[PDB]
Amino acid sequence: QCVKLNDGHFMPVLGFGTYAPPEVPRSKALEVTKLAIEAGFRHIDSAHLYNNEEQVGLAIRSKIADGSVKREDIFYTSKLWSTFHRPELVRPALENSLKKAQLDYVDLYLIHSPMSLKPGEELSPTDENGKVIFDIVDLCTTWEAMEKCKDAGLAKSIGVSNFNRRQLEMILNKPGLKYKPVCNQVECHPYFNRSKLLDFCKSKDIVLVAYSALGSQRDKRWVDPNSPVLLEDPVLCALAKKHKRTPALIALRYQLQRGVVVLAKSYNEQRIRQNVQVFEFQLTAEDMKAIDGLDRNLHYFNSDSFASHPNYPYS
Numbered sequence: 001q002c003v004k005l006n007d008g009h010f011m012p013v014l015g016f017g018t019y020a021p022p023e024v025p026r027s028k029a030l031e032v033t034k035l036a037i038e039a040g041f042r043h044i045d046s047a048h049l050y051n052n053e054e055q056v057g058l059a060i061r062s063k064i065a066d067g068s069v070k071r072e073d074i075f076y077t078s079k080l081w082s083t084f085h086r087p088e089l090v091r092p093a094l095e096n097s098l099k100k101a102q103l104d105y106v107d108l109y110l111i112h113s114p115m116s117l118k119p120g121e122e123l124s125p126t127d128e129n130g131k132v133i134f135d136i137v138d139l140c141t142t143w144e145a146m147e148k149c150k151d152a153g154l155a156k157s158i159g160v161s162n163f164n165r166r167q168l169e170m171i172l173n174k175p176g177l178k179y180k181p182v183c184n185q186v187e188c189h190p191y192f193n194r195s196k197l198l199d200f201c202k203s204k205d206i207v208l209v210a211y212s213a214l215g216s217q218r219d220k221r222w223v224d225p226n227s228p229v230l231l232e233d234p235v236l237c238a239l240a241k242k243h244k245r246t247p248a249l250i251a252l253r254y255q256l257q258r259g260v261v262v263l264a265k266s267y268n269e270q271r272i273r274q275n276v277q278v279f280e281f282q283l284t285a286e287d288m289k290a291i292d293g294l295d296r297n298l299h300y301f302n303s304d305s306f307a308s309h310p311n312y313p314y315s
Ligand SMILES: NC(=O)c1ccc[n+]([C@@H]2O[C@H](COP(=O)([O-])OP(=O)(O)OC[C@H]3O[C@@H](n4cnc5c(N)ncnc54)[C@H](OP(=O)(O)O)[C@@H]3O)[C@@H](O)[C@H]2O)c1
Pocket: 016, 017, 018, 019, 020, 045, 046, 112, 161, 162, 185, 186, 210, 211, 212, 213, 214, 215, 216, 217, 231, 246, 248, 249, 263, 264, 265, 266, 267, 268, 271, 272, 274, 275
């Protein structure tokens, strides 16, 4: 139930998504992360951006203290936020995340996004029009700082998120590169299946990790309400009926069968327990072809605040 990363460490192929929007009480992350571990999730995905690392960390530490898991059984991810791309800010950002979570190391630390933002106090600094104040940082220098964090033992593995093929290539061609990214965590689902990026990642031994695999949380801040609702897709519905599973389970299994590590966020006890059933059934070649046919270049995260950035990954 794991994949071997290009640095020798192992990553569980099903991960628990911990982001919930600010209107959800912070205490919920503690409750649901414990439930996720109880259900069998061993890969837990968080970030500085999520304002939940204390709660998620506490959940992990609670399950270690009561004997349910060892630290070595848990794969915990955090991410460097975009206001901290300047190399001198990388290690301090990681140390802050470790202090919040009360952990000695993260299993994985990612550059959250290639879209560098102005260093400062704000998560999303703005001008007048609500467009973000961008920063211009050579992400190869950021990567060097990430490498130093691995060497120091603060992160077992390092990788990237929201990078396109070209951006990934720039890191891979860096003179004196010490560690390749182990993964690229990107938006990935049947409406945006990333086939060409997946092929590229496979060719370089980089794991593609899918987020919004269930169609995203459809947050009004970044997602058009008109966009088709992935879990109401008729083809996924037909496949769910055929296998007597659910559309969510079909969407998750699709990713595993393509060699994509898949995340799944749920703050509902029943759905958390449901999602671990992804290992209990298989899709046929014809099922996979049907799902492949759904691709319509649809990234749910689709806002002016992303699209105007000079390092916006989508074309
Ligand atoms: N690197 C990045 O920039 C980035 C971006 C986005 C997400 N992520 C990571 O990926 C995780 C997941 O992506 P996401 O947050 O977009 O959500 P998602 O996994 O696509 O899930 C979307 C929604 O599906 C619902 N759901 C879950 N299981 C279900 C089931 N069995 N049946 C029906 N509905 C189900 C959840 O609602 P309920 O809670 O009500 O069950 C959830 O809000 C995040 O939490 C985060 O850790 C990373």
